[PDB]
Design a protein around this motif. Structure first.
Motif, PDB file in Angstrom:
ATOM      1  N   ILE A 312       0.806  -1.200   0.000  1.00  0.00           N
ATOM      2  CA  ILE A 312       0.000   0.000   0.000  1.00  0.00           C
ATOM      3  C   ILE A 312       0.855   1.273   0.000  1.00  0.00           C
ATOM      4  CG2 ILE A 312      -1.779   1.300   1.227  1.00  0.00           C
ATOM      5  CD1 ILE A 312      -2.721  -1.381   2.417  1.00  0.00           C
ATOM      6  N   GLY A 317       2.820   6.657  -1.773  1.00  0.00           N
ATOM      7  CA  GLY A 317       4.003   7.439  -2.135  1.00  0.00           C
ATOM      8  C   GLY A 317       3.905   8.241  -3.431  1.00  0.00           C
ATOM      9  N   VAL A 373       0.198   2.737  18.831  1.00  0.00           N
ATOM     10  CA  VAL A 373      -0.892   2.641  17.886  1.00  0.00           C
ATOM     11  C   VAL A 373      -1.784   3.880  17.946  1.00  0.00           C
ATOM     12  CG1 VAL A 373      -2.889   1.344  17.172  1.00  0.00           C
ATOM     13  CG2 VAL A 373      -0.785   0.179  17.736  1.00  0.00           C
ATOM     14  N   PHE A 377      -2.517   6.519  14.546  1.00  0.00           N
ATOM     15  CA  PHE A 377      -3.771   6.938  13.945  1.00  0.00           C
ATOM     16  C   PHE A 377      -4.175   8.343  14.297  1.00  0.00           C
ATOM     17  CE2 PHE A 377      -5.560   4.288  17.431  1.00  0.00           C
ATOM     18  CZ  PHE A 377      -6.439   5.177  18.013  1.00  0.00           C
TER      19      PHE A 377
ATOM     20  N   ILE G  34      13.404   9.003   5.107  1.00  0.00           N
ATOM     21  CA  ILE G  34      12.302   9.400   4.246  1.00  0.00           C
ATOM     22  C   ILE G  34      11.581  10.630   4.750  1.00  0.00           C
ATOM     23  CG2 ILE G  34      10.035   8.690   3.355  1.00  0.00           C
ATOM     24  CD1 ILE G  34      11.370   5.843   3.212  1.00  0.00           C
ATOM     25  N   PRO G  69      10.879   3.044  -3.714  1.00  0.00           N
ATOM     26  CA  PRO G  69      10.163   2.540  -2.536  1.00  0.00           C
ATOM     27  C   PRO G  69       9.938   1.011  -2.531  1.00  0.00           C
ATOM     28  CG  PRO G  69       9.114   4.535  -3.350  1.00  0.00           C
ATOM     29  CD  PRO G  69      10.177   4.180  -4.343  1.00  0.00           C
ATOM     30  N   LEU G  73      11.086  -1.312   0.673  1.00  0.00           N
ATOM     31  CA  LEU G  73      10.162  -2.224   1.329  1.00  0.00           C
ATOM     32  C   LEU G  73      10.710  -3.649   1.419  1.00  0.00           C
ATOM     33  CD1 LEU G  73       6.667  -1.213  -0.079  1.00  0.00           C
ATOM     34  CD2 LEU G  73       7.625  -0.532   2.150  1.00  0.00           C
TER      35      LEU G  73
HETATM   36  C1  HEA Z   1      -7.009   7.868   7.956  1.00  0.00           C
HETATM   37  C2  HEA Z   1      -6.829   6.806   8.726  1.00  0.00           C
HETATM   38  C3  HEA Z   1      -5.717   5.827   8.547  1.00  0.00           C
HETATM   39  C4  HEA Z   1      -4.757   5.715   7.451  1.00  0.00           C
HETATM   40  C5  HEA Z   1      -4.680   6.476   6.174  1.00  0.00           C
HETATM   41  C6  HEA Z   1      -3.881   4.624   7.933  1.00  0.00           C
HETATM   42  C7  HEA Z   1      -2.738   4.155   7.125  1.00  0.00           C
HETATM   43  C8  HEA Z   1      -1.901   2.988   7.386  1.00  0.00           C
HETATM   44  N1  HEA Z   1      -1.976   2.251   8.501  1.00  0.00           N
HETATM   45 FE1  HEA Z   1      -3.190   2.581  10.179  1.00  0.00          FE
HETATM   46  N2  HEA Z   1      -4.685   2.698  11.645  1.00  0.00           N
HETATM   47  C9  HEA Z   1      -5.691   3.568  11.756  1.00  0.00           C
HETATM   48  C10 HEA Z   1      -5.950   4.621  10.796  1.00  0.00           C
HETATM   49  C11 HEA Z   1      -5.277   4.811   9.525  1.00  0.00           C
HETATM   50  N3  HEA Z   1      -4.187   4.126   9.157  1.00  0.00           N
HETATM   51  C12 HEA Z   1      -6.583   3.390  12.922  1.00  0.00           C
HETATM   52  C13 HEA Z   1      -7.777   4.182  13.372  1.00  0.00           C
HETATM   53  C14 HEA Z   1      -6.014   2.212  13.563  1.00  0.00           C
HETATM   54  C15 HEA Z   1      -6.431   1.599  14.874  1.00  0.00           C
HETATM   55  C16 HEA Z   1      -7.671   0.770  14.960  1.00  0.00           C
HETATM   56  C17 HEA Z   1      -7.822   0.570  16.438  1.00  0.00           C
HETATM   57  O1  HEA Z   1      -7.228  -0.344  17.004  1.00  0.00           O
HETATM   58  O2  HEA Z   1      -8.560   1.448  17.108  1.00  0.00           O
HETATM   59  C18 HEA Z   1      -4.851   1.890  12.701  1.00  0.00           C
HETATM   60  C19 HEA Z   1      -4.000   0.716  12.971  1.00  0.00           C
HETATM   61  C20 HEA Z   1      -2.964   0.131  12.092  1.00  0.00           C
HETATM   62  C21 HEA Z   1      -2.346  -1.183  12.378  1.00  0.00           C
HETATM   63  C22 HEA Z   1      -2.574  -2.143  13.522  1.00  0.00           C
HETATM   64  C23 HEA Z   1      -1.720  -1.834  14.766  1.00  0.00           C
HETATM   65  C24 HEA Z   1      -2.202  -2.631  15.965  1.00  0.00           C
HETATM   66  O3  HEA Z   1      -3.486  -2.583  16.339  1.00  0.00           O
HETATM   67  O4  HEA Z   1      -1.415  -3.319  16.597  1.00  0.00           O
HETATM   68  C25 HEA Z   1      -1.424  -1.285  11.274  1.00  0.00           C
HETATM   69  C26 HEA Z   1      -0.529  -2.421  10.986  1.00  0.00           C
HETATM   70  O5  HEA Z   1       0.010  -2.517   9.885  1.00  0.00           O
HETATM   71  C27 HEA Z   1      -1.603  -0.063  10.480  1.00  0.00           C
HETATM   72  C28 HEA Z   1      -0.851   0.217   9.238  1.00  0.00           C
HETATM   73  C29 HEA Z   1      -1.085   1.287   8.288  1.00  0.00           C
HETATM   74  C30 HEA Z   1      -0.367   1.340   7.008  1.00  0.00           C
HETATM   75  C31 HEA Z   1       0.681   0.444   6.425  1.00  0.00           C
HETATM   76  C32 HEA Z   1      -0.934   2.522   6.376  1.00  0.00           C
HETATM   77  C33 HEA Z   1      -0.581   3.086   5.049  1.00  0.00           C
HETATM   78  O6  HEA Z   1      -1.737   3.270   4.194  1.00  0.00           O
HETATM   79  C34 HEA Z   1       0.227   4.384   5.269  1.00  0.00           C
HETATM   80  C35 HEA Z   1       1.075   4.640   4.015  1.00  0.00           C
HETATM   81  C36 HEA Z   1       1.769   5.993   3.941  1.00  0.00           C
HETATM   82  C37 HEA Z   1       3.101   6.156   3.914  1.00  0.00           C
HETATM   83  C38 HEA Z   1       4.078   5.028   4.013  1.00  0.00           C
HETATM   84  C39 HEA Z   1       3.664   7.552   3.805  1.00  0.00           C
HETATM   85  C40 HEA Z   1       3.647   8.037   2.365  1.00  0.00           C
HETATM   86  C41 HEA Z   1       4.532   7.205   1.468  1.00  0.00           C
HETATM   87  C42 HEA Z   1       5.807   7.513   1.114  1.00  0.00           C
HETATM   88  C43 HEA Z   1       6.532   8.761   1.580  1.00  0.00           C
HETATM   89  C44 HEA Z   1       6.536   6.556   0.176  1.00  0.00           C
HETATM   90  C45 HEA Z   1       7.806   5.902   0.702  1.00  0.00           C
HETATM   91  C46 HEA Z   1       7.557   5.112   1.982  1.00  0.00           C
HETATM   92  C47 HEA Z   1       8.234   3.989   2.348  1.00  0.00           C
HETATM   93  C48 HEA Z   1       9.329   3.341   1.528  1.00  0.00           C
HETATM   94  C49 HEA Z   1       7.917   3.315   3.664  1.00  0.00           C
HETATM   95  N4  HEA Z   1      -2.515   0.764  10.993  1.00  0.00           N
END
Ligand code: HEA
Ligand SMILES: CCCCCCCCCCCCCCCCCC(=O)OCC(COC(=O)CCCCCCCCCCCCCCCCC)OC(=O)CCCCCCCCCCCCCCCCC
Ligand code: HEA
Ligand SMILES: CCCCC/C=C/C/C=C/C/C=C/C/C=C\CCCC(=O)O[C@H](COC(=O)CCCCCCCCCCCCCCCCC)COP(=O)(O)OCCN
Ligand SMILES: CCCCC/C=C\C/C=C/C/C=C\C/C=C\CCCC(=O)O[C@H](COC(=O)CCCCCCCCCCCCCCCCC)COP(=O)(O)OCCN
Ligand SMILES: CCCCC/C=C/C/C=C/CCCCCCCC(=O)O[C@H](COC(=O)CCCCCCCCCCCCCCC)COP(=O)(O)OCC[N+](C)(C)C
Ligand SMILES: CCCCCC/C=C/CCCCCCCCCC(=O)O[C@H](COC(=O)CCCCCCCCCCCCCCC)COP(=O)(O)OC[C@@H](O)CO
Ligand SMILES: CCCCCC/C=C\CCCCCCCCCC(=O)O[C@H](COC(=O)CCCCCCCCCCCCCCC)COP(=O)(O)OC[C@@H](O)CO
Ligand SMILES: CCCCCC/C=C\CCCCCCCCCC(=O)O[C@H](COC(=O)CCCCCCCCCCCCCCC)COP(=O)(O)OC[C@@H](O)CO
Ligand SMILES: CCCCCCCCCCO[C@@H]1O[C@H](CO)[C@@H](O[C@H]2O[C@H](CO)[C@@H](O)[C@H](O)[C@H]2O)[C@H](O)[C@H]1O
Ligand SMILES: C[C@H](CCC(=O)O)[C@H]1CC[C@H]2[C@@H]3[C@H](O)C[C@@H]4C[C@H](O)CC[C@]4(C)[C@H]3C[C@H](O)[C@]12C
Ligand SMILES: C[C@H](CCC(=O)O)[C@H]1CC[C@H]2[C@@H]3[C@H](O)C[C@@H]4C[C@H](O)CC[C@]4(C)[C@H]3C[C@H](O)[C@]12C
Ligand SMILES: C[C@H](CCC(=O)O)[C@H]1CC[C@H]2[C@@H]3[C@H](O)C[C@@H]4C[C@H](O)CC[C@]4(C)[C@H]3C[C@H](O)[C@]12C
Ligand code: CUA
Ligand SMILES: [Cu+2]
Ligand SMILES: [Mg+2]
Ligand code: NA
Ligand SMILES: [Zn+2]
Lengths: 514, 98, 84, 43, 259, 46, 227, 79, 58
Positions: A312, A317, A373, A377, G34, G69, G73
């Motif tokens: 993702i 990115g 965590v 978020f 980054i 990227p 990864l």
């Molecule tokens: C708008 C809301 C939103 C968004 C967009 C995201 C985006 C992401 N989230 Fe998140 N997340 C939440 C809201 C969100 N999350 C919420 C609410 C929970 C908790 C639920 C709860 O327990 O209450 C949560 C929990 C959560 C967990 C579980 C943790 C746990 O309970 O133990 C994980 C695990 O992978 C995770 C991963 C990610 C990843 C990989 C993205 C990716 O989509 C992010 C990607 C973005 C980037 C990486 C930056 C931009 C990219 C670049 C600059 C390129 C180059 C980067 C690299 C080479 C790394 N999230």
């Protein structure tokens, strides 16, 4: 006339306006809850003295912020106002059904606020996992009221999704292709597809939670051969798409803002942005069990879900770099909206990067159910979604209202809010690595310094919310009417004046097929 | 194994549906359902943009496949030109319905 | 497959009528005839008071709160065994 | 963006009042509940 | 005067009444489940059917009588209906998941077998086989009805539509019969849970579908449909085919394989 | 037909800034107050 | 345990946790690479009067910024997954202990030989002997042999809880009707603290976990004193 | 023959983090052996291995409940 | 039956300034006033019921 206009609407602009009001209000409810949370944690020991009450406050906070502030403002408000204006449509496809999508939220919200008033509240967390959510640990009507609230909100958003998709597909100019629609329209079309496929699985799940509580089913009770892990799968199958639903309209709004205030006629890599949103949408469906990395699933499974979650980042990115490429060689105008948008870009990147950390199931053992965590978020959601909402709101306010905001006050507002959210959430990264769990009303003595700082932060942001209320007042009180708007050739929303008339595009646009 | 009793649209269609259907036969399109074909857009051969009033919003897709339409108001009178590509449009207003 | 029939050149209502009465309904008849022969009140099952069945975490919101909605006393025991 | 002058300009005095009334609307009720928290628990 | 082919809808009170009816049913059900009263549920249901009647009345008025359903508007409604059908496909998917989850991994408390110890499955070659033949036949008959309409054949449209509705009712009675005669209940652990909640929701859908086809019947009696414009009938047909398909999946999944 | 233009496309009056201040106050204020009163209410039962 | 003003993880006690610390340092290095890049590049865009508002050809560059990227990864995935499969792995335990979650306390069971079981509950703040830690001390600790591979088995008799000990790199949800396995291997004696890491109702904050790792001789004698 | 028992060893029938089935298999396997060998008059101590393994792995409250149900006649597994 | 679809087209296309949900007769008005009444009655009742359930009962 008041009833006919405001209770009985079939007009996308007024319906939009209802959503923004409802959203702003629930936002106040949510904001209060959030401060109660940080009051309790602001020095060691107890403040409320009832800890079930605290879990009620935590649970209500999330439901309010997600379902009743973010979703209605971004989809219901900005979506209804802007989408028809950008594709030159006279209203939505189903203007009467559209009113019901709205009038379902107040009762949806009444049921939730009722659930906290009766019995001892629903202190389950926003996941509402059984058995804590079940009929022994939470005897009474509070959980059932929470369940019905969610049914009403999901029906509201499902009907809303059918309307947006049908409209965006069917009601463009005949000549206009889908690849000639603006990015915000795309962002809403994809968000609606996500809602359509995800919200019904939730409905299935929480219906089976309701039957367990009141009809002696045992879908999730091991006594009957049930499995509480089944509920987790169904909930998160919806829940992950839900987080992407919450940010995708922000991605669009940001693309419009960065482009406008760079003085560009379009964003960089338009088709790359369409590609990035589609790919995010798709991959958003196949990653859910990263929320379940400690429940004891197979190692090969944990390995797939780690690897798939990581991809993702690639299309995400592309968007980030595409927005920076839009700024490249801009005649950059330092409006408040541009400041909100630049805030988004950096603070979302940080939030996203902690996302990548958590994607590792090896590490997630130690970080799961900790403040790491919560810090993730709150960066990606509450300084993403909210910053996008604020940038959108100041950029487009004069279109909706006809009046201007005071740019200087708007800038003081950004600066105060910027400090407060960073001061609130940044230290929580430390609390997490050092092992402070979430959903705790009191912590071991070591964790005091960061919790104290975090809580002081929350107060600064309160001052921003109060000041914003004043800011709006001042605009309406002063009445500086808009005259002229820049870059109308590439921003059709503005082309009918400020505010645009009740009925717009009574006579459609003219567009040639060449 | 054969008989009638079910009205045709020609018999029973009404309102705006009927309007649309009758105009479609005569080969016209008063309610803008079809994409209007373009001319050469030179001053002598402008794009004729009809209108029930003195102005209408034109969107010019300058080059086929461009993702950005260029929007502007075309008013009654001397042919105007797209700000981006300079193709010519002229408001040939009026009447439309039959 | 293609069933075993042969036609797809005109798809009239006639053809779908020919199927409604020539194949569709005769199947309903045969399957009805089948069922109206195997039906005959089954040997009712012996009551073992197993704990994974007759679950009552909360009493039903109708009745005495211990009878299910289509309770049939000839085949549906309560958790204390069959009724008279 | 360009705009006309204020039809009903809001002077500094008027702003100060507006801002005070706004802040007190958020602060006084929350404060009342919070200041009396002990009288609710001790019960 | 507009010069696009879309329908601007008159201001209507039914969305409000619908939303208020949703409050009454959900808060009435709570009242029922806990504080043991049906008043609010009764009231809610009543305002719900009242709303649904008037709202769908006004569409028929808008389309059959006022003529606002241009081809543009029709295209709209087609997508709208498919999109709704998809959302229901995902809804039922929740219940199949829960079934396959439980059936492929029977827990120690059931015996570690499927079906669970204590459960006496229904025979899929008895009534369930008949139930299947009935809906499949109803699929053939509604198809005849559609071709009758398109060839302006009034009498046959009505006959094929009647045979459909009857078959749908036969299904419903046979299912109620089998529910009553079943030697297990909704409370007999996860076997009863998955069985009666899936077949249940499907059952409800058969009624909604039959109710919809009956509306289509009386509308055809009253000459509303033309040989080309008759979208109420198309939606009902698709809704029926959806119902027939969900049955097949239930029949294979729950009745045959998980016996 | 409905009223058009600035101040008229909203379900509340902006004709008087001080009547408006009072309403905004009540509106946002009630919203911010509610969780403080729900908590208090739950503390006064047990 | 955490100490005041701490920023990173608890110091590692098992080898697994040591392996994670290093894998965190690897990952966080890339994260700082980054974030720095995006910050530098933002400020670059905003600090010039020079302009170029006409159309930019937009593909040549998009290959750099997808391929790169992807490689980064893989660099994170490989070591992540090595560690993952290592945390599973054929163990050969000397001992097997079971913890069972309840509202609001843990009970423990050592049953390879004798039916030893005890309850374990939070010392109240009012009953703490000076030097004892608020909210973290149990009355009866989990006594375990050090430098010995132990099978932990986690479940609950009511709602969900989660049995966690940060220092040792462990978190395993406690689910009724389910028996969840993790392996625990301390490299040193001592006291090591964790806490319920899943919301289990009103007393979730107050049902902690203390391991006491001692050598086998002393472990043996303690077991026998507990029957 | 063959003992020195420390604790239940690894079992590739149950390689994963969920060991619920491993408790259960060994609980049936024991009572199945111990019924068979009590009906034939043979040695119950061939069944011993399985008893050691289920006692190690199963919670007391599971075994306690399962034992009450063989007594009561309401035990869902085939013994 | 017979085809009275054309009479109805005329009655509902009459230019009498009524919204479609009232355009049929006094019946439409009756059915409307009744729907709206039951909805507002029941809403008030449900709020009251909530009030009743927000405190306990010895
Ligand atoms: C708008 C809301 C939103 C968004 C967009 C995201 C985006 C992401 N989230 Fe998140 N997340 C939440 C809201 C969100 N999350 C919420 C609410 C929970 C908790 C639920 C709860 O327990 O209450 C949560 C929990 C959560 C967990 C579980 C943790 C746990 O309970 O133990 C994980 C695990 O992978 C995770 C991963 C990610 C990843 C990989 C993205 C990716 O989509 C992010 C990607 C973005 C980037 C990486 C930056 C931009 C990219 C670049 C600059 C390129 C180059 C980067 C690299 C080479 C790394 N999230
Ligand atoms: C608020 C309290 C801060 C407390 C710091 C006190 C430290 C004293 C210890 C005194 C020093 C003790 C030395 C012993 C080291 C042992 C620690 C260890 O074991 O190691 C673990 C450590 C390792 O990391 C660190 O080494 C600390 C990181 C500090 C980052 C600097 C940000 C500072 C700004 C905060 C102010 C708030 C407002 C702005 C917020 C800005 C958002 C990032 O902790 C982490 O893992 C943190 C994980 C956070 C991941 C988020 C990535 C965001 C990128 C932002 C970069 C922007 C560029 C700066 C540009 C900055 C200008 C904008
Ligand atoms: C979008 C979602 C959202 C938003 C905005 C927020 C906003 C905030 N959140 Fe929360 N939070 C969650 C979603 C969100 N949160 C979720 C899902 C959880 C997990 C719940 C659980 O554990 O079950 C959680 C949990 C959570 C915890 C942990 C509770 C615990 O584990 O015990 C804390 C602690 O500090 C916290 C703090 C805050 C603070 C201080 C703010 C704010 O103060 C930050 C500043 C932002 C604002 C004040 C908003 C201002 C904007 C508006 C009002 C809109 C204006 C609109 C218009 C003008 C049109 N949140
Ligand atoms: C308690 C359980 C009871 C069941 C409850 C469920 C009921 C649902 C179904 C009800 C049936 C209703 C049918 C409608 C009744 C009469 C239709 C009469 C009108 C008509 O006109 O239909 C006639 C045919 O009817 C016809 O054969 C009708 C023929 C009907 C066929 C039924 C099957 C007959 C039994 C023998 C078949 C078994 C063996 C076949 C094996 C072969 C396998 C392929 C056509 O004749 P025509 O000259 O082409 O007309 C042209 C003028 N328009
Ligand atoms: C031909 C059959 C057609 C169905 C007609 C019967 C009832 C209408 C139910 C409609 C709603 C559908 C499903 C509700 C859930 C379960 C009921 C399943 C259907 C059923 O009727 O199952 C029966 C039990 O139902 C029971 O408890 C009684 C339960 C009745 C109360 C309804 C429960 C309310 C819960 C509704 C949740 C609403 C969620 C909708 C969300 C909408 C999308 C957001 C089976 O009888 P039994 O005696 O257990 O065993 C048979 C013994 N001989
Ligand atoms: C984790 C890994 C992240 C990776 C980050 C990657 C960063 C890569 C940066 C690369 C920059 C170096 C490229 C230098 C090569 C030379 C190409 C060039 O840029 O030259 C331009 C090519 O034009 C055109 O396509 C349009 C010119 C603009 C094309 C480039 C636009 C994007 C530049 C990047 C913007 C900042 C964002 C960087 C991403 C982080 C020249 O301009 P023109 O011909 O339009 O006008 C002149 C017209 N004449 C010929 C007719 C007279
Ligand atoms: C004992 C009784 C118990 C009943 C309890 C529950 C009640 C269910 C009601 C059943 C559904 C009946 C729906 C009737 C809709 C009538 C309106 C209609 O059919 O309107 C048509 C448009 O379709 C349209 O809007 C499309 C409208 C289709 C709506 C889809 C209906 C299905 C949704 C029902 C809800 C299911 C929810 C499941 C809950 C878990 C009108 O256009 P045409 O046909 O083109 O005609 C025009 C020609 O005359 C001109 O030439
Ligand atoms: C325990 C209780 C839980 C809560 C459930 C109760 C929720 C709500 C109360 C129900 C009130 C129903 C009232 C009737 C609504 C019918 C909507 C409809 O018929 O929508 C139509 C459009 O969408 C279309 O066809 C396609 C849309 C068809 C959907 C019909 C409405 C179904 C509502 C239920 C949704 C169930 C979700 C299923 C998945 C979980 C008509 O569009 P309008 O904009 O009206 O007119 C437009 C004009 O051009 C027509 O001339
Ligand atoms: C559609 C094809 C796309 C390609 C991807 C494939 C995805 C799914 C299909 C595969 C389903 C069958 C898998 C068969 C293998 C055995 C399953 C199994 O047995 O897995 C169990 C449950 O799976 C289960 O029901 C799983 C139940 C299914 C849930 C799948 C979720 C996706 C649903 C979305 C569908 C979209 C809508 C499409 C409509 C047609 C879980 O693990 P256990 O075995 O209990 O652990 C055993 C140990 O603990 C004991 O020692
Ligand atoms: C979480 C966001 C809110 C936190 C920040 C709130 C800022 C505090 C605002 C103060 O509000 C008032 O403070 C008084 C305390 O000074 C209280 O008077 C109380 O105390 C006085 C004496 O100290 C008495 O005269 C009063 O009668 C008695 O009610 C009064 O009720 C309360 O409204
Ligand atoms: C309806 C259909 C075609 C009539 C036509 O369109 O000409 C006719 C052709 C053959 C007919 C069938 C055959 O005559 C044989 C059967 C005779 C029985 O009297 C009824 C069922 C029976 C199975 C008939 C039903 C129906 O009348 C059929 C199916
Ligand atoms: C061909 C297609 C559409 C362009 C158009 O029809 O105008 C474009 C739009 C975005 C492109 C993708 C994105 O730019 C991201 C990737 C960039 C890499 O350099 C190639 C693969 C890559 C995955 C691209 C493949 C392809 O060129 C895409 C998918
Ligand atoms: C006499 C009447 C004519 C209606 C008309 O042409 O307007 C006919 C035509 C189709 C007939 C219906 C259809 O043939 C279907 C049904 C057939 C059954 O034999 C009687 C009831 C049944 C429901 C019929 C009632 C009535 O006899 C109808 C409605
Ligand atoms: Cu036990 Cu949290
Ligand atoms: Cu996720
Ligand atoms: Mg957890
Ligand atoms: Na506290
Ligand atoms: Zn042009």
């Amino acid at each position: 006339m008041f009833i006919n206009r405001w209770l009985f609407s079939t007009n996308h602009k007024d319906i939009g306006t209802l959503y923004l009001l409802f959203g702003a209000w629930a936002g106040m409810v949510g904001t209060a809850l959030s401060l109660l949370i940080r009051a309790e944690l602001g020095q060691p020991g107890t403040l409320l003295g009832d800890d079930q009450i605290y879990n009620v406050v935590v649970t209500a906070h999330a439901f309010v912020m997600i379902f009743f502030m973010v979703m209605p403002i971004m989809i219901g408000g900005f979506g209804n106002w802007l989408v028809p204006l950008m594709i030159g449509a006279p209203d939505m496809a189903f203007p009467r059904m559209n009113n019901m999508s709205f009038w379902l939220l107040p009762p949806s919200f009444l049921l939730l606020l009722a659930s906290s008033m009766v019995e001892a509240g629903a202190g389950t967390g926003w996941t509402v996992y059984p058995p804590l959510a079940g009929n022994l640990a939470h005897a009474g009507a509070s959980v059932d009221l929470t369940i019905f609230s969610l049914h009403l909100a999901g029906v509201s958003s499902i009907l809303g999704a059918i309307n947006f998709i049908t409209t965006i597909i069917n009601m463009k100019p005949p000549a206009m292709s889908q690849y000639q629609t603006p990015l915000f329209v795309w962002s809403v079309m994809i968000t609606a597809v996500l809602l359509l496929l995800s919200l019904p699985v939730l409905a299935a799940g929480i219906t089976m939670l309701l039957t367990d509580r009141n009809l002696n089913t045992t879908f999730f009770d091991p006594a009957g051969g049930g499995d509480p892990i089944l509920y987790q799968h169904l909930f998160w199958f919806f829940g992950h798409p839900e987080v992407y639903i919450l940010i995708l309209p922000g991605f669009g709004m940001i693309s419009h803002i960065v482009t406008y205030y760079s003085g560009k006629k379009e964003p960089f890599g338009y088709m790359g942005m369409v590609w990035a949103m589609m790919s995010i949408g798709f991959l958003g469906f196949i990653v859910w069990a990263h929320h379940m990395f400690t429940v004891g699933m197979d190692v090969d499974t944990r390995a797939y879900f780690t690897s798939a979650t990581m991809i993702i980042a690639i299309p995400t990115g592309v968007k980030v770099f595409s927005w920076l490429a839009t700024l490249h060689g801009g005649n950059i105008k330092w409006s408040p909206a541009m400041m909100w948008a630049l805030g988004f870009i950096f603070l979302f990147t940080v939030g996203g990067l902690t996302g990548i950390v958590l994607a590792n199931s090896s590490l997630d053992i130690v970080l799961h159910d900790t403040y790491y965590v919560v810090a993730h978020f709150h960066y990606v959601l509450s300084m993403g979604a909210v910053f996008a909402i604020m940038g959108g709101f100041v950029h487009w306010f004069p279109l909706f209202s006809g009046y201007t905001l005071n740019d200087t006050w708007a800038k003081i507002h950004f600066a105060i809010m910027f400090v407060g959210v960073n001061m609130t959430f940044f230290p929580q990264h430390f609390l997490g690595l050092s092992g402070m769990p979430r959903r705790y009303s009191d912590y071991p003595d070591a964790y005091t310094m960061w919790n104290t700082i975090s809580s002081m932060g929350s107060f600064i942001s309160l001052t921003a919310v109060m000041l914003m209320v004043f800011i709006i007042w001042e605009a309406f009180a002063s009445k500086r009417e808009v005259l002229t708007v820049d870059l109308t050739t590439t921003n059709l929303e503005w082309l009918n004046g400020c505010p645009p008339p009740y009925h717009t595009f009574e006579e459609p646009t003219y567009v040639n097929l060449k | 194994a054969s008989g009638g009793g079910v009205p045709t649209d020609e018999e029973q269609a009404t309102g705006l549906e009927r309007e649309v259907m009758l105009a479609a036969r005569k080969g016209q399109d008063p309610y803008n359902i079809l994409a209007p074909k373009a001319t050469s857009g030179t001053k002598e051969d402008p794009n004729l943009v009809p209108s029930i009033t003195n102005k209408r919003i034109v969107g010019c897709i300058c080059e086929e496949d461009n993702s950005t339409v260029i929007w502007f108001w075309l008013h009654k009178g001397e042919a105007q030109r797209c700000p981006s590509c300079g193709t010519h449009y002229k408001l040939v207003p009026h009447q439309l319905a039959h | 497959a293609s069933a075993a029939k042969g036609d797809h050149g005109g798809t009239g209502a006639r053809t779908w009528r020919f199927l409604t009465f020539g194949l569709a309904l005769p199947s309903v008849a045969l399957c009805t005839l089948n069922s109206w022969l195997h039906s005959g009140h089954r040997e009712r099952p012996a009551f073992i008071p197993y704990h994974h069945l007759r679950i009552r975490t909360k009493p039903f919101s109708w009745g005495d709160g211990n009878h299910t909605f289509f309770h049939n006393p000839r085949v549906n025991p309560l958790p204390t065994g069959y009724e008279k | 963006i360009t705009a006309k002058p204020a039809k009903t300009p809001t002077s500094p005095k008027e702003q100060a009042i507006g801002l005070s009334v706004t802040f007190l609307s958020f602060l006084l009720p929350a404060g009342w509940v919070l200041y009396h928290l002990d009288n609710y628990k001790k019960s | 005067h507009q010069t696009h082919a879309y329908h601007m809808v008159n201001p209507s009170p039914w969305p409000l009444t619908g939303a208020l009816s949703a409050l009454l049913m959900t808060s009435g059900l709570t009242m029922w489940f806990h504080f043991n009263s049906m008043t609010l549920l009764m009231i809610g249901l009543t305002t719900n059917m009242l709303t649904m009647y008037q709202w769908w009345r006004d569409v028929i008025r808008e389309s059959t009588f006022q003529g606002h359903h241009t081809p543009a508007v029709q295209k709209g409604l087609r997508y709208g209906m498919i999109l709704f059908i998809i959302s229901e496909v995902l809804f039922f998917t929740g219940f199949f998941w829960a079934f396959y989850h439980s059936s492929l991994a029977p827990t120690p408390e059931l015996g570690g077998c499927w079906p669970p110890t204590g459960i006496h499955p229904l025979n899929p070659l008895e009534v369930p086989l008949l139930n299947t033949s009935v809906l499949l036949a109803s699929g053939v008959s509604i198809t005849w009805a559609h071709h009758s309409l398109m060839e302006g054949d009034r009498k046959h449209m009505l006959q094929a539509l009647f045979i459909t509705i009857t078959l749908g009712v036969y299904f419903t009675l046979l299912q109620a019969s089998e529910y009553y005669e079943a030697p297990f209940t909704i409370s007999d652990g996860v076997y009863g849970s998955t069985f009666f909640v899936a077949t249940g929701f499907h059952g409800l859908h058969v009624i909604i579908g039959s109710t919809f086809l009956i509306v289509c019947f009386f509308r055809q009696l009253k000459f509303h449909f033309t040989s080309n414009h008759h979208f109420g009938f198309e939606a009902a047909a698709w809704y029926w085919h959806f119902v027939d398909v969900v049955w097949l999946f239930l029949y294979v999944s729950i009745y045959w394989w998980g016996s | 037909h409905y009223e058009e233009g600035p101040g008229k496309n909203i379900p509340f009056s902006v004709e008087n800034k001080w009547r408006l201040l009072a309403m905004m106050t009540l509106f946002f204020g009630s919203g911010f107050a509610a969780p403080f009163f729900i908590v208090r209410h739950q503390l006064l039962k047990k | 345990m955490a100490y005041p003003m701490q920023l990173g993880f608890q110091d590692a006690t098992s080898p697994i946790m040591e392996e994670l610390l290093h894998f965190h340092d690897h990952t966080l290095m890339i994260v700082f690479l980054i974030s720095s890049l995006v910050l530098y590049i933002i400020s670059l865009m905003l600090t010039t009067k020079l302009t170029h508002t006409s159309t930019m050809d937009a593909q040549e560059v998009e290959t750099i910024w997808t391929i790169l990227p992807a490689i980064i990864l893989i660099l994170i995935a490989l070591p992540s997954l090595r560690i993952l499969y290592m945390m599973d792995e054929i163990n050969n335990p000397s001992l097997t202990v079971k913890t069972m979650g309840h509202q609001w306390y843990w009970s423990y069971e050592y049953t390879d030989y004798e039916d030893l079981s005890f309850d374990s509950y939070m010392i109240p703040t009012s009953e703490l002997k000076p030097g004892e830690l608020r909210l973290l001390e149990v009355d009866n600790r989990v006594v375990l042999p050090m430098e010995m591979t132990i099978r932990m088995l986690v479940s609950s008799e009511d709602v969900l809880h989660s049995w966690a000990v940060p220092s040792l790199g462990l978190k395993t949800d406690a689910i009724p009707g389910r028996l969840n396995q993790t392996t625990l291997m301390s490299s040193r004696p001592g006291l090591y603290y964790g806490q319920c890491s899943e919301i289990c109702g009103s007393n979730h904050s107050f049902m902690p976990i203390v391991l006491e790792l001692v050598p086998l001789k002393y472990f043996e004698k303690w077991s026998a004193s507990m029957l | 023959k063959i003992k020195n028992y420390q604790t239940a060893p690894f079992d590739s029938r149950f390689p994963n983090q969920n060991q619920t089935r491993n408790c259960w298999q060994n609980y049936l396997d024991f009572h199945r052996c111990e019924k068979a060998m009590t009906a034939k008059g043979g040695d119950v101590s061939v069944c011993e291995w399985y008893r050691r393994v289920y006692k190690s792995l199963c919670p007391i409250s599971w075994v306690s409940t399962w034992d009450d149900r063989r007594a009561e006649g309401t035990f869902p597994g085939k013994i | 039956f017979e085809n009275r679809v054309a009479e109805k087209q005329k009655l509902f296309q009459e230019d009498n300034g009524l919204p479609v949900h009232l355009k049929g007769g006094a019946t439409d008005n009756i059915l409307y006033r009744v729907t709206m009444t039951l909805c507002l009655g029941g809403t008030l009742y449900s709020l009251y019921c909530l009030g009743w359930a927000s405190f306990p009962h010895k």
